Amino acid sequence: TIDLADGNYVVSRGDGWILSRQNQILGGSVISNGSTGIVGDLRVNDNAIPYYYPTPSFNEEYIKNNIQTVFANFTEANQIPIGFEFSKTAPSNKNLYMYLQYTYIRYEIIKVLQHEIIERAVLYVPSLGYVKSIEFNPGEKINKDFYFLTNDKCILNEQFLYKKILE
Amino acid sequence: TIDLADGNYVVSRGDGWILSRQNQILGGSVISNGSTGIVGDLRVNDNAIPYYYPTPSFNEEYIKNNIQTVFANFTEANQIPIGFEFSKTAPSNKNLYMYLQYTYIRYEIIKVLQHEIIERAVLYVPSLGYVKSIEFNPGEKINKDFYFLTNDKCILNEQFLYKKILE
Amino acid sequence: RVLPYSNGLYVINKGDGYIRTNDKDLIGTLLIEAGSSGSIIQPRLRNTTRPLFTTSNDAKFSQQYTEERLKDAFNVQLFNTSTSLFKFVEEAPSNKNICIKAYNTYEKYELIDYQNGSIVNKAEYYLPSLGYCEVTNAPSPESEVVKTQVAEDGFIQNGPEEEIVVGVIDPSENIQEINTAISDNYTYNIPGIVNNNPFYILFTVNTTGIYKINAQNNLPSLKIYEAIGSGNRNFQSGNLCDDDIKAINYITGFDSPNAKSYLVVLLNKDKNYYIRVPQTSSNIENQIKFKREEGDLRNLMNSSVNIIDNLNSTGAHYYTRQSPDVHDYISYEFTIPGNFNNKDTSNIRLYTSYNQGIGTLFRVTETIDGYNLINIQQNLNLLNSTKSIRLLNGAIYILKVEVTELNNYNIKLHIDITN
């Protein structure tokens, strides 16, 4: 129940979103005893793919057009490659595991009626990445929460940046 | 005279082999007064070449096939490039010389008869590299041993990993 | 060790950092003279990478398929191409040389047909990962050489211990969907096109609550599954949205053919659920009734209510069913042989042979609104229970069993009646 005038709004939640079940897809490297690991990535037109969750009334096109008019235009931008990498050094006693996960911006577009949200379509367009380190002795049981994101989330704080879709 | 049953064995000696006369082929860089040098390499299909020393009864093919069944399959693997590099910083008083040399794995395949080795064919397939530093004032005579490997050797410890060739 | 799992397809992530024996996977060792530093880089000059795959059945569990199941389970994008890159770097101390060696690695996925107590099919998919590296003191090159025999082909894990399982929609079972969110009641007709095969029903609900879901005449027996991570992302009030999720989590339900059952489950508005109707067999038309239960029946929450119509006037009876996991529930609605005097009784001992449970006993009265459970006995300890109770002939009761210790895949319930 959100305090806005009846109508359609375009909305940016954060950079820094990450998706259910998708930790570990890219693989992960394991490094031991105070050597250093550096995993990183690029961006042709795989990383580049955005994920659309449309609704009746908010078709893919509608979404794309409408958020590219307000915010970061992505189709244009993710043609030029950009890189990112992380550099984790291990302690000397034990060894550690680090794996790469792609971060996304969460755009969504919302129908409001009666200070209430009746409908929401969502677009995740890929930003950069994020790595998670963990130190382990072999046999040491690990928290399932570490390897499995069970519900989408932002690893940064969210936000709610909005614009009314015009008539 | 080695304690094995009559027959043909496939054998891995170490990673870390380096070859007679071949130090300095790649060149070397000379860096002075506490600046830092970084030499390194890649691997298209030059570094990629393996060196075969076959015998009657152990032809190139025989060798290739037989060690790729047991060990690191190289023809497949050395199509994807892999890099390596080294970073030597010089002292501040004097200046130094560092040169690059390719390391190899030494595979060999051996006919044994009477707890004795009657025959041996050899394959050097390239692994990564190795650099040798040395500090010098000009005029300072250098040990010929430093620039010239007179007989093949392993710069790591050897090993002797083996499998019988089947019938 | 019991590993109850409501039979079907499961893909597991058995962990990262796997390598093959005999350094089939070593990139190479390089040796770092004291006071220098040295790295080994996978730059991805060339993308292509090789996964490794082995299966019990090529015909069923083909690499293409077992790849698709990873898409289903973890939305894995790429299988033999990574643009993601790795390097390992090390500095040697000034006293001694160091030497760093690097191996390529794999995440190890397992794909499983787990039908009815045992894995009837299994594939192992080794997905190319991002490295393992060992740093050791430089070995003395004079150190003696041990004639040493190579090892059996296989795998070593260097990553931390991991095993995380994900249920997946069986691509051979169709999906049918209910576009309208279920509100308070809803009756669904099994369409033509399912042809009495198994299939899935995707649906959602409007306001969150407890629902009784049965089929016509509580037959066939159903299962319900939550879809993982549903209902963040898109939503349209009143209807469902696809979300794009075929990774599923078993809530409750039997796999048994021709057992009579109804499900009683909690359902949350911000999630999507699949139901799995099994092979119909029958040529008559069937239906799935969803009712929202606001009454006493919420007591059976996240239980499948098993139906026993068939008691003999006296004697031993038993009812073997897939056991739920520790701290989940199986329930049992039974009506006791004999006409209802309201003074007549039959003596009823309720044992269980293999697993322990907390049994809860209710008398059932039914009104036009719904069941009413009157509370008869609590805290009953079932495992080989000496105990008995006099129940009323012709009256109808429900036993709700919480599993406490899980000692066997099936839970066998006895109703041994005396007079």
Coordinates of N, CA, C and O in Angstrom, one line a residue, chain B residues 58-141:
Chain B
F58 N 58.3 -47.9 -30.4 CA 57.6 -46.8 -29.8 C 57.4 -45.6 -30.6 O 58.1 -44.6 -30.4
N59 N 56.6 -45.7 -31.6 CA 56.4 -44.6 -32.6 C 55.6 -43.4 -32.0 O 55.0 -43.5 -30.9
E60 N 55.7 -42.3 -32.7 CA 55.1 -41.0 -32.1 C 53.7 -41.3 -31.6 O 53.4 -41.2 -30.4
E61 N 52.8 -41.6 -32.5 CA 51.4 -42.0 -32.2 C 51.3 -42.9 -31.0 O 50.7 -42.6 -30.0
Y62 N 52.0 -44.1 -31.0 CA 52.0 -45.0 -29.8 C 52.2 -44.2 -28.5 O 51.4 -44.3 -27.6
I63 N 53.2 -43.3 -28.5 CA 53.6 -42.6 -27.3 C 52.4 -41.7 -27.0 O 51.8 -41.8 -25.9
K64 N 52.0 -40.8 -27.9 CA 50.9 -39.8 -27.7 C 49.7 -40.5 -27.1 O 49.3 -40.2 -26.0
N65 N 49.2 -41.5 -27.8 CA 48.0 -42.2 -27.4 C 48.2 -42.7 -26.0 O 47.4 -42.3 -25.2
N66 N 49.2 -43.4 -25.8 CA 49.4 -44.1 -24.6 C 49.5 -43.3 -23.3 O 49.2 -43.8 -22.3
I67 N 50.1 -42.1 -23.4 CA 50.2 -41.3 -22.2 C 49.0 -40.4 -22.1 O 48.7 -40.0 -21.0
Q68 N 48.3 -40.1 -23.2 CA 47.0 -39.3 -23.1 C 45.9 -40.1 -22.5 O 44.9 -39.6 -21.9
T69 N 46.0 -41.4 -22.5 CA 45.0 -42.3 -21.9 C 45.1 -42.3 -20.4 O 44.1 -42.5 -19.7
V70 N 46.3 -42.1 -19.9 CA 46.6 -42.2 -18.5 C 46.6 -40.8 -17.8 O 46.0 -40.6 -16.8
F71 N 47.3 -39.9 -18.5 CA 47.7 -38.6 -17.9 C 47.0 -37.5 -18.7 O 46.2 -37.7 -19.6
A72 N 47.3 -36.3 -18.2 CA 46.9 -35.0 -18.8 C 46.9 -35.2 -20.3 O 47.9 -35.3 -20.9
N73 N 45.7 -35.1 -20.9 CA 45.6 -35.0 -22.3 C 46.0 -33.7 -22.8 O 45.3 -32.7 -22.6
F74 N 47.1 -33.6 -23.6 CA 47.7 -32.3 -24.0 C 47.1 -31.7 -25.3 O 46.8 -30.5 -25.3
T75 N 47.0 -32.5 -26.3 CA 46.6 -32.0 -27.6 C 45.3 -31.2 -27.5 O 45.2 -30.1 -28.0
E76 N 44.3 -31.8 -26.7 CA 43.1 -31.1 -26.3 C 43.4 -29.9 -25.5 O 42.9 -28.8 -25.8
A77 N 44.2 -30.0 -24.5 CA 44.3 -28.9 -23.4 C 45.1 -27.7 -23.9 O 44.7 -26.6 -23.6
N78 N 46.1 -27.9 -24.7 CA 47.0 -26.8 -25.2 C 46.4 -26.1 -26.4 O 47.2 -25.5 -27.3
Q79 N 45.1 -26.2 -26.6 CA 44.4 -25.4 -27.6 C 43.9 -24.2 -26.9 O 43.8 -23.1 -27.5
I80 N 43.6 -24.2 -25.6 CA 43.1 -23.1 -24.9 C 44.2 -22.3 -24.3 O 45.1 -22.9 -23.6
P81 N 44.4 -21.0 -24.5 CA 45.6 -20.4 -24.0 C 45.5 -20.3 -22.5 O 44.4 -20.1 -22.0
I82 N 46.7 -20.4 -21.9 CA 47.0 -20.2 -20.5 C 48.2 -19.3 -20.4 O 49.1 -19.5 -21.2
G83 N 48.2 -18.5 -19.4 CA 49.3 -17.5 -19.2 C 50.1 -17.8 -18.0 O 49.7 -18.6 -17.1
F84 N 51.3 -17.2 -17.9 CA 52.1 -17.2 -16.7 C 53.1 -16.1 -16.8 O 53.6 -15.8 -17.8
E85 N 53.5 -15.6 -15.6 CA 54.5 -14.5 -15.5 C 55.2 -14.4 -14.2 O 54.7 -15.0 -13.2
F86 N 56.3 -13.7 -14.2 CA 57.1 -13.6 -13.0 C 57.5 -12.1 -12.7 O 57.7 -11.4 -13.7
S87 N 57.6 -11.7 -11.5 CA 57.9 -10.3 -11.2 C 59.0 -10.1 -10.2 O 58.9 -10.1 -9.0
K88 N 60.2 -9.8 -10.8 CA 61.4 -9.6 -10.0 C 61.8 -8.2 -9.8 O 62.0 -7.4 -10.8
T89 N 62.0 -7.7 -8.6 CA 62.5 -6.4 -8.3 C 63.9 -6.4 -8.0 O 64.4 -7.3 -7.2
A90 N 64.6 -5.4 -8.5 CA 66.1 -5.4 -8.3 C 66.5 -4.7 -7.0 O 65.8 -3.9 -6.5
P91 N 67.7 -5.1 -6.5 CA 68.2 -4.3 -5.4 C 68.5 -2.9 -5.8 O 68.3 -2.6 -7.0
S92 N 68.9 -2.0 -4.9 CA 69.1 -0.6 -5.3 C 70.5 -0.2 -5.6 O 70.8 0.8 -6.3
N93 N 71.5 -0.9 -5.0 CA 72.9 -0.7 -5.3 C 73.2 -1.1 -6.8 O 73.7 -0.2 -7.5
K94 N 72.9 -2.3 -7.2 CA 73.4 -2.8 -8.5 C 72.1 -3.3 -9.3 O 71.0 -3.2 -8.8
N95 N 72.4 -3.7 -10.5 CA 71.3 -4.1 -11.4 C 71.3 -5.6 -11.8 O 72.3 -6.3 -11.5
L96 N 70.2 -6.1 -12.3 CA 70.1 -7.5 -12.5 C 69.4 -7.9 -13.8 O 68.7 -7.2 -14.5
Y97 N 69.7 -9.2 -14.1 CA 69.4 -9.9 -15.4 C 68.5 -11.1 -15.2 O 68.9 -12.0 -14.4
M98 N 67.4 -11.2 -15.8 CA 66.5 -12.3 -15.7 C 66.0 -12.7 -17.1 O 65.7 -11.9 -17.9
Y99 N 66.1 -14.0 -17.2 CA 65.7 -14.6 -18.5 C 64.7 -15.8 -18.4 O 64.7 -16.6 -17.4
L100 N 63.8 -16.0 -19.4 CA 62.7 -16.9 -19.4 C 63.1 -18.2 -20.1 O 63.7 -18.2 -21.1
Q101 N 62.7 -19.3 -19.4 CA 62.9 -20.6 -19.9 C 61.6 -21.5 -19.8 O 61.0 -21.6 -18.7
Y102 N 61.2 -22.2 -20.8 CA 60.0 -23.0 -20.8 C 60.2 -24.3 -20.0 O 61.1 -25.0 -20.3
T103 N 59.3 -24.6 -19.0 CA 59.3 -25.9 -18.4 C 58.4 -26.9 -19.1 O 57.4 -26.5 -19.8
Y104 N 58.7 -28.2 -19.0 CA 58.0 -29.3 -19.6 C 57.7 -30.4 -18.6 O 58.4 -30.5 -17.6
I105 N 56.7 -31.2 -18.9 CA 56.5 -32.5 -18.3 C 57.3 -33.5 -19.1 O 57.4 -33.4 -20.3
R106 N 58.0 -34.4 -18.4 CA 58.7 -35.5 -19.1 C 57.9 -36.8 -18.9 O 57.8 -37.3 -17.9
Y107 N 57.3 -37.2 -20.0 CA 56.7 -38.5 -20.1 C 57.7 -39.4 -20.8 O 58.5 -38.9 -21.6
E108 N 57.7 -40.7 -20.5 CA 58.6 -41.6 -21.2 C 57.9 -43.0 -21.2 O 57.0 -43.2 -20.3
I109 N 58.2 -43.8 -22.2 CA 57.6 -45.2 -22.2 C 58.6 -46.2 -22.4 O 59.4 -46.1 -23.3
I110 N 58.6 -47.3 -21.6 CA 59.8 -48.1 -21.3 C 59.5 -49.6 -21.5 O 58.4 -50.1 -21.0
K111 N 60.4 -50.3 -22.2 CA 60.3 -51.8 -22.2 C 61.2 -52.3 -21.1 O 62.4 -52.0 -21.0
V112 N 60.6 -53.2 -20.3 CA 61.3 -53.8 -19.2 C 61.4 -55.3 -19.5 O 60.4 -55.9 -19.9
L113 N 62.5 -55.9 -19.2 CA 62.8 -57.3 -19.4 C 63.8 -57.7 -18.5 O 65.0 -57.2 -18.6
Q114 N 63.5 -58.6 -17.5 CA 64.5 -59.1 -16.6 C 64.8 -58.1 -15.5 O 66.0 -57.9 -15.2
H115 N 63.8 -57.4 -15.0 CA 63.9 -56.4 -14.0 C 65.0 -55.3 -14.5 O 65.6 -54.6 -13.7
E116 N 65.1 -55.2 -15.8 CA 66.0 -54.3 -16.5 C 65.3 -53.5 -17.6 O 64.5 -54.1 -18.3
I117 N 65.7 -52.2 -17.8 CA 65.1 -51.4 -18.9 C 65.9 -51.5 -20.2 O 67.0 -50.9 -20.3
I118 N 65.4 -52.2 -21.1 CA 66.0 -52.4 -22.4 C 65.7 -51.2 -23.4 O 66.5 -51.0 -24.3
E119 N 64.7 -50.5 -23.2 CA 64.3 -49.4 -24.2 C 63.4 -48.3 -23.6 O 62.5 -48.6 -22.8
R120 N 63.6 -47.1 -24.1 CA 62.9 -46.0 -23.6 C 62.7 -44.9 -24.7 O 63.7 -44.4 -25.3
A121 N 61.5 -44.5 -24.9 CA 61.1 -43.4 -25.7 C 60.6 -42.3 -24.8 O 60.2 -42.6 -23.7
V122 N 60.7 -41.1 -25.3 CA 60.5 -39.9 -24.4 C 59.7 -38.9 -25.1 O 59.9 -38.5 -26.2
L123 N 58.8 -38.3 -24.3 CA 58.0 -37.1 -24.8 C 58.1 -36.0 -23.8 O 57.9 -36.1 -22.6
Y124 N 58.5 -34.8 -24.3 CA 58.4 -33.6 -23.5 C 57.3 -32.8 -24.0 O 57.3 -32.3 -25.1
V125 N 56.2 -32.6 -23.2 CA 55.1 -31.8 -23.5 C 55.2 -30.6 -22.6 O 55.4 -30.8 -21.4
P126 N 55.1 -29.4 -23.1 CA 55.3 -28.1 -22.4 C 54.3 -27.9 -21.4 O 53.1 -28.0 -21.6
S127 N 54.8 -27.4 -20.2 CA 53.9 -27.1 -19.1 C 53.8 -25.5 -19.1 O 53.2 -25.0 -20.0
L128 N 54.5 -24.9 -18.1 CA 54.6 -23.4 -18.1 C 56.0 -22.9 -18.3 O 56.7 -23.5 -19.1
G129 N 56.5 -22.0 -17.5 CA 57.9 -21.5 -17.6 C 58.7 -21.4 -16.3 O 58.3 -21.8 -15.2
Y130 N 59.8 -20.7 -16.3 CA 60.7 -20.5 -15.2 C 61.7 -19.4 -15.6 O 62.2 -19.3 -16.6
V131 N 61.9 -18.4 -14.6 CA 62.9 -17.4 -14.9 C 64.0 -17.5 -13.8 O 63.8 -17.8 -12.7
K132 N 65.2 -17.1 -14.3 CA 66.4 -17.1 -13.5 C 67.0 -15.7 -13.4 O 67.2 -15.0 -14.4
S133 N 67.2 -15.2 -12.1 CA 67.6 -13.9 -11.9 C 69.1 -13.9 -11.6 O 69.6 -15.0 -11.2
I134 N 69.8 -12.9 -11.9 CA 71.2 -12.7 -11.4 C 71.6 -11.3 -11.3 O 71.4 -10.5 -12.3
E135 N 72.3 -10.9 -10.3 CA 72.7 -9.5 -10.0 C 74.2 -9.4 -10.5 O 75.0 -10.3 -10.3
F136 N 74.5 -8.3 -11.1 CA 75.8 -8.1 -11.7 C 76.2 -6.7 -11.8 O 75.4 -5.8 -12.0
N137 N 77.5 -6.5 -11.6 CA 78.2 -5.2 -12.0 C 78.8 -5.5 -13.4 O 79.1 -6.6 -13.7
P138 N 78.9 -4.4 -14.2 CA 79.4 -4.7 -15.5 C 80.9 -5.1 -15.4 O 81.6 -4.5 -14.6
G139 N 81.4 -6.1 -16.2 CA 82.7 -6.7 -16.0 C 82.7 -7.9 -15.2 O 83.4 -8.8 -15.4
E140 N 81.8 -7.9 -14.1 CA 81.7 -9.1 -13.2 C 81.5 -10.3 -14.1 O 80.5 -10.3 -14.9
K141 N 82.4 -11.2 -14.1 CA 82.4 -12.5 -14.8 C 81.2 -13.3 -14.2 O 81.1 -13.4 -13.0

